[PDB]
Design a protein around this nucleic acid. Sequence first.
RNA 1: UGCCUCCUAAAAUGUAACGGAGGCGCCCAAAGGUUCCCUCAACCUGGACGGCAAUCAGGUGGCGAGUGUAAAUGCACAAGGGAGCUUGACUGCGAGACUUACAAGUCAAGCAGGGACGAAAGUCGGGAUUAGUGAUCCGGCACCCCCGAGUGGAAGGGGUG
Lengths: 178, 62, 73, 57, 119, 48
Amino acid sequence: QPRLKERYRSEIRDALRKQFGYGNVMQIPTVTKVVVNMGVGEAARDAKLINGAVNDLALITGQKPEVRRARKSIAQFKLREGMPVGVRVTLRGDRMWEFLDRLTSIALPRIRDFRGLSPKQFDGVGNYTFGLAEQAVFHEVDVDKIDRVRGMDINVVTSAATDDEGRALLRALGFPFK
Amino acid sequence: PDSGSVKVGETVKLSYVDQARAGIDPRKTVWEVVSDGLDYIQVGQTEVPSRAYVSAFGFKGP
Amino acid sequence: SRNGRDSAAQRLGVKRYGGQVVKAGEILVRQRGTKFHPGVNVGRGGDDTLFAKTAGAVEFGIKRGRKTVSIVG
Amino acid sequence: MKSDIHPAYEETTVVCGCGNTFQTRSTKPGGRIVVEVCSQCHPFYTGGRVARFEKRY
Amino acid sequence: SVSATRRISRLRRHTRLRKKLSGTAERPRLVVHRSARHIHVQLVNDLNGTTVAAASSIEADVRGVPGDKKARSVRVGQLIAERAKAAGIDTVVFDRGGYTYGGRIAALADAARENGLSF
Amino acid sequence: VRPKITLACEVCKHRNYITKKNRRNDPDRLELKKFCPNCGKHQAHRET
RNA sequence: UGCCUCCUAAAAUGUAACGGAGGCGCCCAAAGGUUCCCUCAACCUGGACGGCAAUCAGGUGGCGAGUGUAAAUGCACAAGGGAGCUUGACUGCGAGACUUACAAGUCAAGCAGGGACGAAAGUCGGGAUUAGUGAUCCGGCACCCCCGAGUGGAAGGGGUG
Ligand SMILES: [Mg+2]
Ligand SMILES: [Mg+2]
Ligand SMILES: [Mg+2]
Ligand SMILES: [Mg+2]
Ligand SMILES: [Mg+2]
Ligand SMILES: [Mg+2]
Ligand SMILES: [Mg+2]
Ligand SMILES: [Mg+2]
Ligand SMILES: [Mg+2]
Ligand SMILES: [Mg+2]
Ligand SMILES: [Mg+2]
Ligand SMILES: [Mg+2]
Ligand SMILES: [Mg+2]
Ligand SMILES: [Mg+2]
Ligand SMILES: [Mg+2]
Ligand SMILES: [Zn+2]
Ligand SMILES: [Zn+2]
């Protein structure tokens, strides 16, 4: 039992009913999926992704990630149609919360300049996305057994129908903001 | 090693051609043996294209 | 001049028409692509030639936005 | 494919220098992930120019 | 809205196999309907849509059966295979209904062949 | 570049078939499981 | 100067000019067969390097993308995209037809042998279709063991590829 999941339906599921006058417990939001991708655009040269893009996201998340291929060819990026350029993984259910806890407690408050992150980074549904500068200090990786550093960005998909309700959901889980 | 010491230094980057020629895989062709299937390779920390790099060693066209 | 070359015409079109009693195997419609679509008792063929499979009269009609070549045997 | 290609992932009790500990699941071998800063050693709880001459400058 | 992706993308598959598999007066078509609770099946005769024999898993002869949901599939496959043989039916085509062959439906198919339906 | 090749049998060496392959994509001899009327059953076939 | 597609072409077919536009003399051992699954382009919003455009998430989007290759007819039910095994890119036939001066060219359900895939129903005698080709003569090769110039053989001839 992940401790952020038991924290979810205990009082936060009770919290939003006071805030909006709903008529069913099905209309209350729930985070459904969290998507992580590197997007290694440098990987179109020299193929530094084998011990470079699969393994580093593996220890951060827990499962082997999907290597993605490019939809069409672009000349200026030196990138064909079908070359590996991005590395995606997906987190559902009981592994999703154990990434949401361990991000927001031992990784995400290792991010400086405490305005939190931006609460203006929602899309129009209630879906968030933030970024990371380098291979962060998710302490599962080590700096002496890696190649070059590489950032990522992390999507979070919810059942929200508007942004502030999606902001009301994701604030109460461990995402700092201003 | 067993005993002794091999002092290296951080002013050296290694390139090693070998007697066993084990980097060559006898199942795949010349454009994948050296260029790993992609199109632009790093050689001198620069952007030299793959087909134009293997052609510098004689392997061209067919 | 630069033009002037053509290909031989290929004699396409509809060959047996509606209400027409045909024997088993006759070419009903020769075409490129499926301008007409096979219906009941009509097979397509390797270059869209809509042969018949049974003796009987030929009738045409609509079936879900695709016009049909059928046989009431 | 939810079989023996994914990395090893069992439960892992994590401690900080603040003393606040908790028990989650991650890929550190031994249950031995050690941090020096956490999310409860910080707020998210409560929080030239004209001041030049005030040292008689 | 995943109660609409499941309906739209199962009559997208049901009409994919219905092209090549028709079912007539001598070889009718057996259409299963796998919900999350029950299964239904009927034999349809696609010339005027006249169903010849159905057998549901909702009446008392199947509702009073011990076992799990596959065990009520093996029972209802013994129903229509002996409800076909009052209409005089001995070969049929098996419509997957859009679903995957395996599980509750494959236990209806292998329990409808042990009582006469030659497929 | 696409020479005509021929597929002899592997039991009885009859040259039963003939087709084309790309000589630089496939520098080795094709193996397919084709019929043989001498034997009346499928056998293997290499090139010559 | 032969071959394919459009237009001239007068709403079946056909139809000339040193009329008007373009292609072909190949490609694919999977880009074929099959069973199964999926939906595109473009546009808007949010995001580490990221920009008009790499990778991610969510909206609106019924064919404006894609088709190995010119154009036309087609294809969203997909022939478009992805995956698992495979060799039907078979052998013996082929009722009946299209086109046709002749020679040619084209399509073919269905029958058996032996297979592939599918739980079955069934589909498969190359490719979404139409081009990627060349008569006869005379030679080469492999096999069948048909005739063998008195007889036994052989030389040579012949047959199916
Ligand atoms: Mg023409
Ligand atoms: Mg190959
Ligand atoms: Mg005309
Ligand atoms: Mg006219
Ligand atoms: Mg294929
Ligand atoms: Mg396809
Ligand atoms: Mg051939
Ligand atoms: Mg004939
Ligand atoms: Mg057979
Ligand atoms: Mg089988
Ligand atoms: Mg056939
Ligand atoms: Mg063909
Ligand atoms: Mg002569
Ligand atoms: Mg003699
Ligand atoms: Mg001789
Ligand atoms: Zn701390
Ligand atoms: Zn043989």
